[model samples]
Target chain A: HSELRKLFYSADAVCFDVDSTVIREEGIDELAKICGVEDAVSEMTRRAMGGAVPFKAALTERLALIQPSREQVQRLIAEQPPHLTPGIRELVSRLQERNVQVFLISGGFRSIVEHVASKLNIPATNVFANRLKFYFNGEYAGFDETQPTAESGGKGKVIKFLKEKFHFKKIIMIGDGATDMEACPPADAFIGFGGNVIRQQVKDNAKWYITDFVELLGELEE
Target chain B: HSELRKLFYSADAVCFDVDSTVIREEGIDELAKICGVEDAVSEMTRRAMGGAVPFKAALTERLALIQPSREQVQRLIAEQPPHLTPGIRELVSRLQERNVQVFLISGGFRSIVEHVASKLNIPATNVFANRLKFYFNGEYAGFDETQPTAESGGKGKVIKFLKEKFHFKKIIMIGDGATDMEACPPADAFIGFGGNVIRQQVKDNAKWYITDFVELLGELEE
Candidate 1:
């Protein structure tokens, strides 16, 4: 998890990735820090983002390492609700103004994504993220494997679903991960957002690589 | 100064910008640190590379602020010679073996450039850099106003000079500054090198943008 990335200049539907693209922190890395398995799981996050390991394995392996408590999750949400990337509120506001549908598609948990989506005035239904369940006694349970984002290529698969269902003229996937670029065929363009994290793969491959969110306003124009 | 940049397979001459390009540090910034005007002059360096101000003015203004001593210059050369980007020695050797002319055109001091060129096995005559003079008592005097790299668009002027004098079939100017991008008209292509610093303007404008030095090996082929 890191700051998510890019956007489509001329599109009806704009899908955003949660971690690096939207917020500046990685979801699992933050959780790992709280649980004191920070060093090991942070390494997993790096390997996943760097494309050395599959996202699913990175996710499953890290979750196994950090078998966190429900209270820990709540504390993360309470004390450290992920701060949106710079200009995110403004970008989302303008998108909503232009009637460009925005969706949050993340491998991160629904609890955090819902909090973010609600704060930004995005519809809760449009938030397509993985679910995190807990045991009756409040231990952290496993994530929803059924969600496409839980597996490798899952973000792209979600993009494929959004593309066909909307029948919209164009859809764009914006994010900072290798999987964000993986959504290209299903999505029209992938802009690499480096406002938070600058991944080398995204920098080299993306159609447009931007480091500031305010630059999106310029991208929206000529 | 920092790591240099790249070229295509068809290139006859490979030209590199010295500061923040072939070397990992900016020349003026290091000088500023030595002069104890590090904060103010470094701010100016950022603005210049970040494209907020003309480098000609930036260089002159910073020089005005930093009245460095001859001892500081000797210390920098002896204690802090600019480190080359990864794979540069090997890459230059391979290019030279293939009979490609490699030139070091820098806005930095000719004294330092000569040392770097010799260490890398490049010809001392190949270094086209600014000359810095000192007073009789060894206080910092002034930089040569005649050198093109000391002024705005100096890199382009140097590139044009090389192209006409040698009649190179293909020339590439690679670096991480606005002036490096400015060399493009005289150069066949400009490869933005972010192996050290990623200036947004260079990244946006260059024909090819690479983050690591080894990435150039692949760029040489395709």
Candidate 2:
């Protein structure tokens, strides 16, 4: 309770999950669907989002299944426009006005994650996500192995790094999955955002939870 | 095209539509769904977006179909959430950094419109939308008849008013439908947005059209 209040007033940065949190659709699922692997990708997504599988295994397995061409990835990046959830734009806007730094730390691919980040004016340098490697033939190569969000507790590691770097007074993480839950160790509060989808584990465990971003305005005060 | 280039080079104010423009979802249609008149409302929205009906007629007919309670309106305003389009936040950030004023001009009611405006730091006073009237019992009463956006060419009238008072050197309207295009008489130019639903008429006639807001960075002279 004290942590929630502290975060409500003092948080200096907010990190978000891209798929099903900041935006309504899962980027991987969309990419997979385009490559005609919707069933396999979605099943994995369901489990990964359900917290039953580690993100690293899910990522490795899913990318192999899709093997989308660079052109396909680019087209998805270009044409599969973000299906942004309600209130995030306004929420991000208000947060920025208050001088709170917005960081997009997602397990999603860099191509899609950064696309969402650039839209919100977060610097390219500020974006932290798994970058996809591409062959000269534009073939599906693999993902960058170095990023933290590529593994279990990866999101937590990123949060710790940001906390140490920014020396933030307080920080909050908002998302809808177990991966987001891991950040709570470093983040002042974990806000389970279920406006688009609600994972019971996330909702049950988050210190703060909401189905609407405007409700945040109310929570910040009361 | 000439007007677009000039406006792009020199615009001082940017006004965005609330439904299907600034946010990815249509507010009234969502409200109608909550009130269980979604089918009727969506049909009208499709027509309105296609420029088949005057915005005023659409507004009047839709509100009557839903007859939403004040509580429902409040819930929608508070909980319905605003699904924002991509690159808009970054675009707004850059625009504000350059000292441009952003105004939200919508045909939707004030309750929902102002909710989104406050999130983006656009002053509540700068938001121009119809107000849904509610009785003492929190029941559906009606919409205010006097507001400019409640009638035909209301957006144009509002644009004219803002132009006169602010004396903006350049102004542009960006949106996805006829109501937005109608404002071009007073607006310096209109940019059609088709990231979600593409209105062919608007795409064909807009001074410039884009499927993504990121295109503006290059169009604004790279």
Candidate 3:
């Protein structure tokens, strides 16, 4: 019982996955419209998740195909709709009440993630994701290869770096993706968010399953 | 490729747990209302979820102690409303567009699950959960101990039984509880939903982390 309580209260920082973790749609899918490859892109995206192809390889291929212009990308991101989950506003409010630091780490693009971070009232520097670059003509140039999230070990690297910098007693990683799962075991706790999307691997790995933000507060209270 | 596509496409059936998954509150906590033990029962509920005690044991003890009247339980369930997750209506519409079958698998009373299931447009028979019996005085009698969800295996057993019965090529389990994780490795995909609540184990294990229903569609499209 003591150990369980300890586990619950240990984290000082909480990290979230952007696409689907905090939003209603995939960040990339929103970008696909501007890239003019929504039809072709959707199928490939499915194939990649079904394990038909490597995620990075598929991602690169899709980006090349979309060829979205810089202006288009920016416009898409700027107009990106906010799809807040149930109780999220309250949950964030409650977390803030406890003075817990929040970060957004995702396998999504920086433009959209930044916007989400701002809305959540989390600092911009706390957001980590791949940056999408567009050509001078406003067409897609490519993603920033330098960003840690653009690489395979993205999530783990972010957690490690954050751990080193913050020295938080308990760090919680919450998301709905394989990448988020990778950060598990390293962080103090990994919460699988299934309210929006349900993945088999994530359900198997998470310690507790919550379907509402109120439950999160309830857990802390416990 | 064809086999993989078929497997991925066969995830037509969607199952959800009732307590905390569908409704915003726990059944035991509701029952506590009978005795004005809301706080105490709520704490016990947390302990049960945090792995301090077996869910069944805790459930049994709580039910026996509360002995809530059937009318009271019914009234509580009727009065206690559940707010749908963001994009849930749209997501369900999308699933229906694809002719996917949806089921409500819960640990809570069948009565409550039935009510919510109806609102979701799911049939009563499709709602699988524990049945609560009432005494002559409208007090608590006992629950359906034989139900698979009440057993130790819980969610895993439901998935297994459903898969065998339906012979589905793929099954996807979504929920916000540790029990939901039991479907991991068995179900084609287990998506951890973090919109409502986030738990360490669920976050760590989910193959996908999603914050919204649309993101789930994005995953399916992928």
Residue A78, candidate 3: alpha-carbon lDDT: 69
Best-to-worst ranking by lDDT: 2, 1, 3
Q: How many clashes show up per model?
A: 26, 4, 57
What tens-digit string does per-residue lDDT give for candidate 1 at A57-119? 777778988987767877888987588877788788877887988888888876677777877
Tens-place lDDT digits, model 2, residues A1-222:
455556566778888888888878888888888878899889877765545677787789888888877678778877956677767876787777788888887878777877777667778777777877543324555666778988878888898898788888778888876657778878766788887787787777666677767666556545
TM-score of each: 0.47, 0.48, 0.46
DockQ measured for candidate 1: 0.00
Local error of candidate 1 at B183, Å?
86
Clashes of 1: 26
DockQ values of all predictions: 0.00, 0.01, 0.01
Please write out the lDDT profile of model 2 over residues B127-158, one tens digit for every residue: 98887755323456566678788788788998
Residues A116-219 of candidate 3: C-alpha lDDT, one tens digit per residue: 77787778988888766532123344666666877675788879888788788678888776667768866667777877788887687666656655556566
User: Tens digit of lDDT per residue, candidate 3, span B29-126?
Assistant: 76676568888777766666654665677878767766666677667656765556654555565667677887777777765666667667776777
- What's the TM-score of chain B for every model shown? 0.87, 0.88, 0.84
lDDT of 3 at A177: 66
- Candidate 3 TM-score, true structure as reference: 0.46
What digit string (tens of lDDT, one per residue) describes model 1 on residues B140-193? 656667767777777888888886788986887777877688778767777788
What TM-score does candidate 1 get on C-alpha atoms? Answer: 0.47
